[PDB]
Write a structure and sequence with these properties.
The structure is cut from a larger assembly and holds chains A (85 residues), B (114 residues), C (207 residues) and D (116 residues). Chain B is an all-alpha fold. Chain B is 56% helix and 0% strand. In chain B, helix 1 packs antiparallel against helix 2 and helix 1 packs parallel to helix 4. The chains are: A mainly alpha (85), B mainly alpha (114), C alpha/beta (207), D mainly alpha (116). Chains in contact: A-D, B-C, C-D. The PDB classes it as oxidoreductase.
Chain lengths: 85, 114, 207, 116
């Protein structure tokens, strides 16, 4: 179907919950990957690669570094997929 | 002055007009050397040898006797060397090797035995 | 002359010395030292930045024409700040002469690949990387060439042990060849052979 | 000065770190193919944890040139694996399956030998 900010937000949060290192209770749509969830650099890199497989497009490292919470991932995906909704 | 069938070196084709080819190459080299500072040793030395080679070309019409004077093997080998020198001179202009030593080595860099 | 003494060749010694000055006059930007040995071998010691310019001049210049790269290797000298000495041995068929060009580097400083000048250098530089750990910049395909895949270390360094750190055997439990730390049934026996008396006064060093 | 040196690829640690993350992504995606292609008996999770362990042991480096060489070597290692120049024995050498666990506490070392 056509994508929506709520559909994207659903999948982004779905992938993150399949990541064994994230306690889903502490997980919110704004929790910082380092500060809140307690992950480190390499964990974040793995999360981005999960989004590459979930949303099926390349997220370069220069862009991938700034994606430090689920909201920014949603904003990046919506921005790159031209969903203005 | 017959036309030899082969140079004997695989991949090196016989040259039909060696004297004219040599004059063009040596003249090009001297033109390139004019872009180097007058006191660079590369210019002084290379102009010396090129003019000697160019003078032999202008004075010896027989190819067989010219090769003996140049002492550079086949005339096609001499032509190939002129092209190599022309290529080198253009690179020298970018490198500017005539400038002072970029850096001295550490105190005991070239000391042997240690 | 003395039947057991190697005869000297003073003409070649003078010719090589004059050509050594010739090279140093033309490339002062890079040449650091020129010397001729008592058995008539010319060595040009250069700053590592001069690898491509010096080698290109020696290959292509009309009075040089060193078309053949006979050999390219490295020497490890741990006492030096730049422990690795890189040695190029060149041959000129036109003038039936040889020349040696030397430069230096440390473990972290890249050297420029000479593959553009001599395509012979391709595998020689892979061997230097493999055996000494010297990196060559802009090499078309730099990787190990002599050591086992996944081998760790650079075994021609003076501080790499002769027998290495690991050894191989077939293990029946895992049905494959495995690597384990080296143990020797007989340790290699180090001999101290140097005489405590000086052999060659001509090479004595200041106290 | 003596601290003014020639770089390898990276002019500072931030440039070097980008290359590290690119190498890590390449290794991360290669593990499933390696386990399948070499028919290893380890899980993809075990392979990826081994990759993470190898990157962590070098986390303390602050010299970009050292980091450059670590990435250069890591990429050579990856190429050997992807091109199948390695055999299954080479891949399994990261796991030391036939080596017994050497003791780490003072007492256990004391009982077995003289080494610290």
């Amino acid at each position: 179907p056509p994508l929506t900010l709520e559909g994207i937000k659903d999948r982004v949060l779905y992938v993150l919950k399949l990541y064994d290192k994230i306690d889903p209770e502490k997980l919110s749509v704004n929790s910082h990957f380092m500060k809140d969830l307690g992950l480190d650099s390499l964990d974040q890199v793995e999360i981005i690669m999960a989004m590459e497989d979930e949303f099926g497009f390349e997220i370069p490292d220069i862009d991938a570094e700034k994606l430090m919470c689920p909201q920014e991932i949603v904003d990046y995906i919506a921005d790159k997929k031209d969903v203005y909704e | 002055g017959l036309l030899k069938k082969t140079t004997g070196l695989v991949g090196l084709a016989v040259c039909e007009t060696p004297h004219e080819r040599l004059k063009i190459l040596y003249t090009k080299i001297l033109d390139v050397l004019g872009h180097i500072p007058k006191n660079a040793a590369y210019r002084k030395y290379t102009e010396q040898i090129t003019n000697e080679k160019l003078s032999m070309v202008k004075a010896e019409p027989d190819v067989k006797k010219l090769e003996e004077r140049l002492q550079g093997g086949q005339i096609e080998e001499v032509i190939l060397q002129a092209e190599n020198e022309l290529s080198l001179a253009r690179k020298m202009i970018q490198w500017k090797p005539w400038e002072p030593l970029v850096e001295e080595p550490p105190a005991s860099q070239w000391k042997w035995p240690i | 002359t003395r039947p057991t003494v190697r005869p000297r060749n003073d003409v070649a010694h003078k010719q090589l010395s004059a050509f050594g000055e010739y090279v140093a006059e033309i490339l002062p930007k890079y040449v650091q030292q020129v010397q001729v040995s008592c058995f008539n071998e010319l060595e040009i010691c250069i700053h590592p930045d001069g690898v491509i310019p010096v080698l290109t001049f020696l290959r292509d210049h009309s009075n040089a024409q060193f078309k053949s790269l006979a050999d390219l290797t490295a020497v490890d000298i741990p006492t030096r700040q730049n422990r690795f000495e890189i040695v190029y041995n060149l041959l000129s068929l036109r003038f039936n002469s040889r020349i040696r060009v030397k430069t230096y580097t440390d473990e972290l400083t890249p050297i420029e690949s000479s593959v553009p000048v001599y395509k012979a250098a391709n595998w020689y530089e892979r061997e230097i990387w493999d055996m000494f750990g010297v990196f060559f910049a802009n090499h078309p395909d730099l990787r190990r060439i002599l050591t086992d895949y996944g081998f760790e270390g650079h075994p021609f360094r003076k501080d790499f042990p002769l027998s290495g750190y690991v050894e191989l055997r077939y293990d029946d439990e895992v049905k494959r060849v495995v690597a384990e730390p080296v143990e020797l049934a007989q340790e290699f026996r180090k001999f101290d052979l140097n005489s405590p008396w000086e052999a060659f006064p001509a090479y004595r060093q200041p106290p | 000065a003596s601290t003014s040196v020639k770089p390898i690829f990276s002019r500072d640690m931030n440039e070097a770190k980008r290359r590290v993350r690119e190498l890590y992504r390449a290794w991360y995606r290669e593990v499933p193919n390696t386990v399948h292609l070499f028919q290893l008996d380890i899980s993809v999770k075990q392979g990826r944890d081994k990759v993470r362990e190898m990157f962590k042991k070098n986390a303390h480096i602050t010299d970009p040139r050292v980091v450059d060489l670590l990435v250069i070597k890591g990429k050579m290692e990856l190429e050997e694996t992807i091109k199948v120049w390695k055999q299954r024995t080479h891949v399994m050498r990261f796991f030391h399956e036939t080596e017994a666990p050497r003791p780490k506490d003072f007492l256990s070392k004391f009982y077995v030998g003289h080494d610290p």
